[PDB]
PDB file of C-alpha atoms and ligand atoms in Angstrom:
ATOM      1  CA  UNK A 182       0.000   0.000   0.000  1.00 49.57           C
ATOM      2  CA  UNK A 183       1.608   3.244  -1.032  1.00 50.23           C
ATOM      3  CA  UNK A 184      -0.118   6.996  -0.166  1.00 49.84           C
ATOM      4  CA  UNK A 185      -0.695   7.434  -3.923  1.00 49.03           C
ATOM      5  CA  UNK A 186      -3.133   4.614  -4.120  1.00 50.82           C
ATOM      6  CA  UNK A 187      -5.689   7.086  -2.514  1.00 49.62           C
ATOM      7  CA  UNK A 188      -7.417   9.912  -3.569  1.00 47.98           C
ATOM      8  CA  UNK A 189      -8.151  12.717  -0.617  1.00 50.48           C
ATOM      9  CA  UNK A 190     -10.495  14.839   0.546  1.00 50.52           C
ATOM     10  CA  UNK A 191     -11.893  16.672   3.302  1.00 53.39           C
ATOM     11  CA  UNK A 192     -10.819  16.609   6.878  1.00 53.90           C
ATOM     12  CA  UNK A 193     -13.302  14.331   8.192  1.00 53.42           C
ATOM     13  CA  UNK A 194     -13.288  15.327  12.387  1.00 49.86           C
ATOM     14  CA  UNK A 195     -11.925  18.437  13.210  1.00 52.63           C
ATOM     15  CA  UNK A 196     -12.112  17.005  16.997  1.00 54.46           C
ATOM     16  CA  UNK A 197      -8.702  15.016  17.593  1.00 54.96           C
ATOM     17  CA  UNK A 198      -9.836  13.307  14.734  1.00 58.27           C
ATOM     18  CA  UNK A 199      -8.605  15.797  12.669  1.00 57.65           C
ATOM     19  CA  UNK A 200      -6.003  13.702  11.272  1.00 56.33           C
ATOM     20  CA  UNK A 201      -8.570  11.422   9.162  1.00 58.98           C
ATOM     21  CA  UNK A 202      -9.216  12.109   6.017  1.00 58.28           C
ATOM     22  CA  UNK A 203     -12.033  11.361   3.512  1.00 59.80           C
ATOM     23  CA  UNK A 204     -10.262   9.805   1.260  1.00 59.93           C
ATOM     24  CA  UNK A 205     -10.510   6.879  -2.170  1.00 59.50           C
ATOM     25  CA  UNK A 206      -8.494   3.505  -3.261  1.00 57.93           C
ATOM     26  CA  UNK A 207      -8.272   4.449  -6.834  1.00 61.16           C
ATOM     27  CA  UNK A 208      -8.498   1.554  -9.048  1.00 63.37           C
ATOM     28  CA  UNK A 209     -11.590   0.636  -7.654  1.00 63.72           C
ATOM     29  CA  UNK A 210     -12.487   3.743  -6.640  1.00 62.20           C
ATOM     30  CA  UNK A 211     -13.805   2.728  -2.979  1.00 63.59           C
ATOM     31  CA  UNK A 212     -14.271   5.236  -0.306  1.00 64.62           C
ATOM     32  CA  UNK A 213     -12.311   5.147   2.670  1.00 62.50           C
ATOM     33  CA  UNK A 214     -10.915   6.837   5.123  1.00 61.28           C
ATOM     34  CA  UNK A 215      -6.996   7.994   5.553  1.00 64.55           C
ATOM     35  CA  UNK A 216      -5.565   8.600   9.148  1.00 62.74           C
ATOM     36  CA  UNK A 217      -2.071  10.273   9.097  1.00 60.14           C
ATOM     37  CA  UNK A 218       0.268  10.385  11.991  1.00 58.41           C
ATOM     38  CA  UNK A 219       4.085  11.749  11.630  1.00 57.64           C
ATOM     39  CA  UNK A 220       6.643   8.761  12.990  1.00 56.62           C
ATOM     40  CA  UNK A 221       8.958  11.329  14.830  1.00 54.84           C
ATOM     41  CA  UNK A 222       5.240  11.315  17.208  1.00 50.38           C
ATOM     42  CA  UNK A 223      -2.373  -1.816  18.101  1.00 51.04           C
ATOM     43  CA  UNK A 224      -1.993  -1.865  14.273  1.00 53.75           C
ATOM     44  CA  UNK A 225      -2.021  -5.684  13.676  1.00 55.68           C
ATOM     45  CA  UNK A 226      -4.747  -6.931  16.366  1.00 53.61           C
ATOM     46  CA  UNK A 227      -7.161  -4.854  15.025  1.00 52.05           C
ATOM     47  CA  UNK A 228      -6.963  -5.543  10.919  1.00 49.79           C
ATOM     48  CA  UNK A 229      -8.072  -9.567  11.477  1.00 51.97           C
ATOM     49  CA  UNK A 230     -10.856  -7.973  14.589  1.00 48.19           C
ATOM     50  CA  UNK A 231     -14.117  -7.875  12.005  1.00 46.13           C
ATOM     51  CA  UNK A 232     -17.712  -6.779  13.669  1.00 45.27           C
ATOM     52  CA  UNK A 233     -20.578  -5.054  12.542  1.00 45.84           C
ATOM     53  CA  UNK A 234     -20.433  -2.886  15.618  1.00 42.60           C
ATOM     54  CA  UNK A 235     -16.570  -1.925  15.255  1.00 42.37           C
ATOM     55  CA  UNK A 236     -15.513  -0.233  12.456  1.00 41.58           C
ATOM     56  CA  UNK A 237     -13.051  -2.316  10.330  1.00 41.06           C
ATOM     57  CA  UNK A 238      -9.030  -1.232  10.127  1.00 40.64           C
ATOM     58  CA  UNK A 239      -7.987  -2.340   6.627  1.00 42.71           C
ATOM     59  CA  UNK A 240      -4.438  -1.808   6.565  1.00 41.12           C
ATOM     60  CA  UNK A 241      -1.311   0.609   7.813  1.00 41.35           C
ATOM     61  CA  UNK A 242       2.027   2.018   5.753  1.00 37.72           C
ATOM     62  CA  UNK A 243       4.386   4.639   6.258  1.00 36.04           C
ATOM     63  CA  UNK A 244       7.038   6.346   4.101  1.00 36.54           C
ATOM     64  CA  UNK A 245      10.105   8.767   5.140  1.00 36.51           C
ATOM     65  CA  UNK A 246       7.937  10.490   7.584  1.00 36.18           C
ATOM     66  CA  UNK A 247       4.544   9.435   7.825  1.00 37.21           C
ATOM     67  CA  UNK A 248       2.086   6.629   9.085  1.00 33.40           C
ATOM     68  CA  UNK A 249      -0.782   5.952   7.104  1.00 35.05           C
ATOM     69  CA  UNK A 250      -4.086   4.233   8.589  1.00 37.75           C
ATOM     70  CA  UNK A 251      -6.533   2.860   6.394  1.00 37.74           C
ATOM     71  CA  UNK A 252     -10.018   2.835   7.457  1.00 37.60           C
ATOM     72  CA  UNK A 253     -13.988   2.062   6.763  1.00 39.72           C
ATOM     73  CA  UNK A 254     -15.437   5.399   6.264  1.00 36.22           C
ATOM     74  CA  UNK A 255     -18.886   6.363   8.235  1.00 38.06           C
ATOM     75  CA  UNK A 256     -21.315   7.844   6.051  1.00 36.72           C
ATOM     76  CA  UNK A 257     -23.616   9.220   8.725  1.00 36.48           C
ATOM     77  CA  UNK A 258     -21.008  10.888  10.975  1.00 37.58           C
ATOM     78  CA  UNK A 259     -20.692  10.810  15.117  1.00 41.35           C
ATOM     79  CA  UNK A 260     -23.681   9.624  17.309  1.00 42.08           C
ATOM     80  CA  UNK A 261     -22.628  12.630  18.936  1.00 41.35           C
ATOM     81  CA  UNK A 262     -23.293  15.139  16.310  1.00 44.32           C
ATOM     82  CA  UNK A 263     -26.658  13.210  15.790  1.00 42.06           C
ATOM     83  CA  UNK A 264     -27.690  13.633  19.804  1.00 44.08           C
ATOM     84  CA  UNK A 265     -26.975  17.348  18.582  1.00 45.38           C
ATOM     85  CA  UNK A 266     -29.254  17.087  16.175  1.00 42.38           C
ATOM     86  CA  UNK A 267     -32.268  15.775  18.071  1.00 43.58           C
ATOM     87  CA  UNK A 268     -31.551  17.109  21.409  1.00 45.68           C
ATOM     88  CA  UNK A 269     -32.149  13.573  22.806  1.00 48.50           C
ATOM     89  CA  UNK A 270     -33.348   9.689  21.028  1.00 50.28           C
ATOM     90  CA  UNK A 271     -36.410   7.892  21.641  1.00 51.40           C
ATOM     91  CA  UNK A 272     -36.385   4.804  23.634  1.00 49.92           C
ATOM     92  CA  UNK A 273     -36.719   2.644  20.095  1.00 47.76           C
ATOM     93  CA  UNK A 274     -32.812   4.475  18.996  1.00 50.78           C
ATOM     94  CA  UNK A 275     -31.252   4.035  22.226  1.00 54.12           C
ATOM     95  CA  UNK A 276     -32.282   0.848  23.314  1.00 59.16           C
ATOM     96  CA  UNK A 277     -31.052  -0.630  19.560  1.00 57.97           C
ATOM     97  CA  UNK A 278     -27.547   1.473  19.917  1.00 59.99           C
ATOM     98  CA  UNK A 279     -27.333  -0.030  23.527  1.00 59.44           C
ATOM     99  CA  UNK A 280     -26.967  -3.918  22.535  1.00 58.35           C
ATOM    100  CA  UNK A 281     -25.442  -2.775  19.164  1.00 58.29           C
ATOM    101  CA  UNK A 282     -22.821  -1.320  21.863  1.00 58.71           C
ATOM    102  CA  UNK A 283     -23.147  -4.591  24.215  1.00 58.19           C
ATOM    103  CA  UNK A 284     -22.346  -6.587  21.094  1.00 57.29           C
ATOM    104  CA  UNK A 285     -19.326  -4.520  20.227  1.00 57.83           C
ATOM    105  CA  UNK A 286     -17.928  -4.744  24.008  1.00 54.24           C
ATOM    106  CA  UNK A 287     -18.520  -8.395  24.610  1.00 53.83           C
ATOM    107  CA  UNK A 288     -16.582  -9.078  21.245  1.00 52.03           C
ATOM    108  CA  UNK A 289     -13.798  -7.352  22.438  1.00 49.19           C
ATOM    109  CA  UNK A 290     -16.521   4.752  24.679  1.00 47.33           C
ATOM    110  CA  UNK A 291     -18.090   8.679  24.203  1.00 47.98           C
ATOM    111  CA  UNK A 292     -20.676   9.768  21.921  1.00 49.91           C
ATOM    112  CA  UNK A 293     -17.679  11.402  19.943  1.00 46.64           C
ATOM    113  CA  UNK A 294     -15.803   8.614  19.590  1.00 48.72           C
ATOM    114  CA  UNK A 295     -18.780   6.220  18.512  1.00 49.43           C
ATOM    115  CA  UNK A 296     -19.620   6.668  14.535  1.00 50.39           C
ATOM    116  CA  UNK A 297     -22.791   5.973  12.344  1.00 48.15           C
ATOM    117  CA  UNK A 298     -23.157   3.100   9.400  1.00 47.55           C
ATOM    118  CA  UNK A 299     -25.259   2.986   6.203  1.00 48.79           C
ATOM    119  CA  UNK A 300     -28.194   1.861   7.700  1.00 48.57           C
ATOM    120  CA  UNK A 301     -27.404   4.367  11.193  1.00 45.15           C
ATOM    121  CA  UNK A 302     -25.282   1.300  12.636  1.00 43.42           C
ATOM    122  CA  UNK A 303     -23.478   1.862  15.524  1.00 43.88           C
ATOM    123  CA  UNK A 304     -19.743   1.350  15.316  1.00 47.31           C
ATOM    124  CA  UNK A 305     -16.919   2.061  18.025  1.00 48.05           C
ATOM    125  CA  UNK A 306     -13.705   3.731  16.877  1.00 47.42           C
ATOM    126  CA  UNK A 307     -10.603   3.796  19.494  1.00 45.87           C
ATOM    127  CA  UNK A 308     -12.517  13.897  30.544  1.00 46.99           C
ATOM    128  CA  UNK A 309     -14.442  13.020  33.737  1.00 49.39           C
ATOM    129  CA  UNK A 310     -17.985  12.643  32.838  1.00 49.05           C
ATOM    130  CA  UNK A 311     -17.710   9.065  31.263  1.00 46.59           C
ATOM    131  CA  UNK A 312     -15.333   7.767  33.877  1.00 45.97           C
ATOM    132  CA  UNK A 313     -16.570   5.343  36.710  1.00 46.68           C
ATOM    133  CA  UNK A 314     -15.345   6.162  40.433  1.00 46.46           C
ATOM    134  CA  UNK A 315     -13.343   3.164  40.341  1.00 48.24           C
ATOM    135  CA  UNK A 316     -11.686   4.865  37.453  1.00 49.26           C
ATOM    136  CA  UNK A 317     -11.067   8.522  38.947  1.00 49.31           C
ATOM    137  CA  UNK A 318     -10.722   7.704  42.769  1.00 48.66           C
ATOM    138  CA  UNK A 319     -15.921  -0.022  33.688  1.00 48.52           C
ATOM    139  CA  UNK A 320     -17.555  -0.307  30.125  1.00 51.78           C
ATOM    140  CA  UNK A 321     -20.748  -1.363  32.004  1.00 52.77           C
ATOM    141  CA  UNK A 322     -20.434   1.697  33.770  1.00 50.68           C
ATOM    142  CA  UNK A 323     -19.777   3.464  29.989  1.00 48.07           C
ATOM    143  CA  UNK A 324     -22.734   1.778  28.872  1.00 46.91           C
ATOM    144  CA  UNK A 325     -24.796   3.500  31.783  1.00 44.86           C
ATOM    145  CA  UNK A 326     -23.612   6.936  31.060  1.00 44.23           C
ATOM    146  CA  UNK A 327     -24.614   6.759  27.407  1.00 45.55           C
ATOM    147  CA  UNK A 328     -28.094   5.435  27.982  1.00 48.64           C
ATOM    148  CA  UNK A 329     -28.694   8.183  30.219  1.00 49.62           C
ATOM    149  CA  UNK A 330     -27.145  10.711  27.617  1.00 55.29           C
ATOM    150  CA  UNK A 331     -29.392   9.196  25.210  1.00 55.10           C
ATOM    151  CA  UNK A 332     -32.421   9.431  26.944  1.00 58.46           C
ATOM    152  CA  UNK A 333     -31.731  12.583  28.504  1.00 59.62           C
ATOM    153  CA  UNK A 334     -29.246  14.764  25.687  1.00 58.49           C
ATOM    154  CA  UNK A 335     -26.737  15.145  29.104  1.00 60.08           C
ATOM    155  CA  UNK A 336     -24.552  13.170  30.646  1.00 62.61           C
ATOM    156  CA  UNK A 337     -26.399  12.156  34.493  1.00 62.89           C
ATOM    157  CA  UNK A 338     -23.136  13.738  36.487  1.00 62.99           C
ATOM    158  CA  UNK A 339     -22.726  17.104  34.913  1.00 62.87           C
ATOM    159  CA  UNK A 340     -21.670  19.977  37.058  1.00 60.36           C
ATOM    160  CA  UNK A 341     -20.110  23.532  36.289  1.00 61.13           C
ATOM    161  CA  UNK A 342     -16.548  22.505  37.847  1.00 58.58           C
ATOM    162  CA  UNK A 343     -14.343  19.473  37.608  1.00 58.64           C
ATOM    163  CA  UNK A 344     -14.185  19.101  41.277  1.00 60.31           C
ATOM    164  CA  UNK A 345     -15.744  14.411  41.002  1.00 59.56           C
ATOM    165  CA  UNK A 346     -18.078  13.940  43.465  1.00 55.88           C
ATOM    166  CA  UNK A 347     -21.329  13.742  41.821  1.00 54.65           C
ATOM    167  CA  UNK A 348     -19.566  10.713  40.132  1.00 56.02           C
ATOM    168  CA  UNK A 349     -18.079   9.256  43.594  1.00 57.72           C
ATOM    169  CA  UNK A 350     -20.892   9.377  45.450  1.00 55.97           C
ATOM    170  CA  UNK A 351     -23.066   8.598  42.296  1.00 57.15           C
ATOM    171  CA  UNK A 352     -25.656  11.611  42.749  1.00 56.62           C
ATOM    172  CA  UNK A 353     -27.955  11.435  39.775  1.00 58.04           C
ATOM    173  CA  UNK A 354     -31.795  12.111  38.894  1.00 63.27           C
ATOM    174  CA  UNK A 355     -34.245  11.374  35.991  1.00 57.82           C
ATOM    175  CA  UNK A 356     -36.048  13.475  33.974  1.00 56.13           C
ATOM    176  CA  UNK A 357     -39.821  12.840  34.011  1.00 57.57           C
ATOM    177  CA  UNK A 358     -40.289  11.246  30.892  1.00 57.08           C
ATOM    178  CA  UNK A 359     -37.181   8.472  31.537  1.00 55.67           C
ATOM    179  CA  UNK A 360     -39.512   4.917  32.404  1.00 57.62           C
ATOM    180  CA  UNK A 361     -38.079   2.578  35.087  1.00 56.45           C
ATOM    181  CA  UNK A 362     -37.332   0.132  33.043  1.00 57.28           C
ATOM    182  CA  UNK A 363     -34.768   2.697  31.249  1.00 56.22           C
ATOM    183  CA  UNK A 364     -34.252   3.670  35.025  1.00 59.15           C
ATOM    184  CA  UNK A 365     -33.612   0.317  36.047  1.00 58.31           C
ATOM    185  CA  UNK A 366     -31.240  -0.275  33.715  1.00 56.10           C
ATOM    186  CA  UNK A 367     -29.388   2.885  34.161  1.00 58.58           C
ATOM    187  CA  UNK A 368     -29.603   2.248  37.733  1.00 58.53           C
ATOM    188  CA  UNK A 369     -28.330  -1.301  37.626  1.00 59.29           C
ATOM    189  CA  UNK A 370     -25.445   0.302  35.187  1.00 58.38           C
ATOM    190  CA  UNK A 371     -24.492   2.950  37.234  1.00 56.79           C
ATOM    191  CA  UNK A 372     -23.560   0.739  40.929  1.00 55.42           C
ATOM    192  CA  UNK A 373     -20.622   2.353  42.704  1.00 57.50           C
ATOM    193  CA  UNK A 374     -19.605  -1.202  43.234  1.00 59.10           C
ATOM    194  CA  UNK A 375     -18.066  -2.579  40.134  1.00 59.93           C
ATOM    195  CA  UNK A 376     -33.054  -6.710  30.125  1.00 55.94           C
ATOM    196  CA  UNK A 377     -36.690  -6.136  29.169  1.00 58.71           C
ATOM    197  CA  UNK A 378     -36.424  -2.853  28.246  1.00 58.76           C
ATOM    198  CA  UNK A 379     -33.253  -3.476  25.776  1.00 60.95           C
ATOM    199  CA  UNK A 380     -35.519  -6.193  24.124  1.00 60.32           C
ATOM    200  CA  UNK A 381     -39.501  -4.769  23.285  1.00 58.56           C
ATOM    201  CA  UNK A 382     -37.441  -1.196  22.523  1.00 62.17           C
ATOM    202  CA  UNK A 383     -34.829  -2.261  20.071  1.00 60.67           C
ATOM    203  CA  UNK A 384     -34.243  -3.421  16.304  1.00 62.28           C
TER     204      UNK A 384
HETATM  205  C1  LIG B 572      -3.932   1.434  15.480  1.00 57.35           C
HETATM  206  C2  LIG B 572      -5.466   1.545  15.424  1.00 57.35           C
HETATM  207  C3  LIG B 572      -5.968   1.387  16.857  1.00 57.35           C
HETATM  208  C4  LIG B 572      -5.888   2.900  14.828  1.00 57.35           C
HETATM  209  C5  LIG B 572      -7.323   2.907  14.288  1.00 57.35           C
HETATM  210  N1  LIG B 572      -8.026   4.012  14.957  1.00 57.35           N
HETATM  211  C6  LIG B 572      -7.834   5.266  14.557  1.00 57.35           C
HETATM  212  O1  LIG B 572      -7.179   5.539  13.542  1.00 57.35           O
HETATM  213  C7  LIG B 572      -8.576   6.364  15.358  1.00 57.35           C
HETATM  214  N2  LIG B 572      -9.722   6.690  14.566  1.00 57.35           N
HETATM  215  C8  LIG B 572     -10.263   7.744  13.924  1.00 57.35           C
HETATM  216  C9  LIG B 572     -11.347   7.221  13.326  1.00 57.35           C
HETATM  217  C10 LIG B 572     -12.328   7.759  12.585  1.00 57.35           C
HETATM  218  C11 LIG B 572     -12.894   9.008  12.841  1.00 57.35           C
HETATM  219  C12 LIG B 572     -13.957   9.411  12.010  1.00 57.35           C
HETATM  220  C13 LIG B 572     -14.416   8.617  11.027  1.00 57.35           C
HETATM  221  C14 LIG B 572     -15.373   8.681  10.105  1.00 57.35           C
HETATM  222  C15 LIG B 572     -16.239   9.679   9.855  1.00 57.35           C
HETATM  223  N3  LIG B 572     -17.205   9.644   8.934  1.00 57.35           N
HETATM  224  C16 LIG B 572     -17.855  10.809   8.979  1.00 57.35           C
HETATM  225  C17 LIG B 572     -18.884  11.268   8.250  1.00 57.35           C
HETATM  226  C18 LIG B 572     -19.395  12.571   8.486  1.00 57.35           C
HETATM  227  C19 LIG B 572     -18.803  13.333   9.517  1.00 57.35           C
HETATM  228  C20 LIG B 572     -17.734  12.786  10.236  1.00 57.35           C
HETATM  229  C21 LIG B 572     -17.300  11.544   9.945  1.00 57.35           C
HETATM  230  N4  LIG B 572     -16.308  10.837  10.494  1.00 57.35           N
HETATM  231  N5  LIG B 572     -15.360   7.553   9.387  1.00 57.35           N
HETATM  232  N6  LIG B 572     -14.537   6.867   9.785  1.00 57.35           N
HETATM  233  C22 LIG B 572     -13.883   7.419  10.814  1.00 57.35           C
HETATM  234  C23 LIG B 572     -12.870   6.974  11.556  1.00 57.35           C
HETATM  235  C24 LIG B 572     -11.409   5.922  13.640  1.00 57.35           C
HETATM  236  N7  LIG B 572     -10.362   5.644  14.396  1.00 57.35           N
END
């Protein structure tokens, strides 16, 4: 694989992703996308690591200077920038992105970091607020935090300063619209010590 097999385009993620790249294999003229890192500052796990749920690396190269990562392009952007959109998803969305995300973690976490399919598939690329208090003193936990978010369009421990404690001493409320068996869930998720409504709300 050599840099001048692709074709380029836009920046694709501005956001510490801003070194991937829209970009095109061109014989068959395939789109892709192009991560670039500079050597002067793993790779072979995740090429033969195929899921739905986890977005596929096909391949690495370098030259002189650069590192080159090839990878499945996203049509529908960030499940961040969608929660954006819509303020917040229905209980059908996040319930289906939930097990989509269970399936991901038990093959092998941020709503920036988790990117949209074809068909609005989820798929896993890669501060405080998504961190357990094991963690800052743990997917499962992750998984709790983004079905609130979901529900809600804000993460359960927000505050205005860093200074922690909502998160250690787990101080979090619903919304009246959230059900309990969303609550329950979220409940059972977020457990300072280390499902019906995932089925009937899903696919
Ligand atoms: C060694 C290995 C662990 C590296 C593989 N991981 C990375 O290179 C880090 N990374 C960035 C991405 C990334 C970021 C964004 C996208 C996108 C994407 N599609 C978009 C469509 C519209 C708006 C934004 C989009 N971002 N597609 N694929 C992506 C892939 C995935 N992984």
């Amino acid at each position: 694989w050599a840099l001048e097999d692709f074709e380029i385009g836009r920046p694709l993620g501005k956001g510490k992703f801003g070194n991937v790249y829209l970009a095109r294999e061109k014989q068959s003229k395939f789109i892709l996308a192009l991560k670039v890192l500079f050597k002067a500052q793993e790779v072979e796990i995740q090429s033969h690591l195929r899921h739905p749920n986890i977005l596929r690396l096909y391949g690495y190269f370098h030259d002189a200077t650069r590192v080159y990562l090839i990878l499945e392009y996203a049509p529908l952007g960030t499940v961040y920038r969608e929660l954006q959109k819509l303020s917040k998803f229905d209980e059908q969305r996040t319930a289906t992105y939930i097990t989509e995300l269970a399936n991901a973690l038990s093959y092998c976490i941020k709503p920036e970091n988790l990117l949209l399919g074809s068909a609005g598939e989820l798929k896993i690329a890669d501060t405080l607020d998504y961190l357990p208090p094991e963690m800052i003193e743990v997917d499962l936990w992750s998984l709790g935090v983004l079905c609130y978010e979901f529900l809600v369009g804000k993460p359960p421990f927000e505050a205005n300063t860093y200074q922690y404690k909502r998160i250690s001493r787990v101080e979090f409320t619903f919304p009246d619209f959230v059900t309990e068996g969303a609550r329950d869930l979220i409940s059972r998720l977020l457990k300072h010590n280390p499902h019906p409504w995932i089925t009937a709300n899903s696919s």
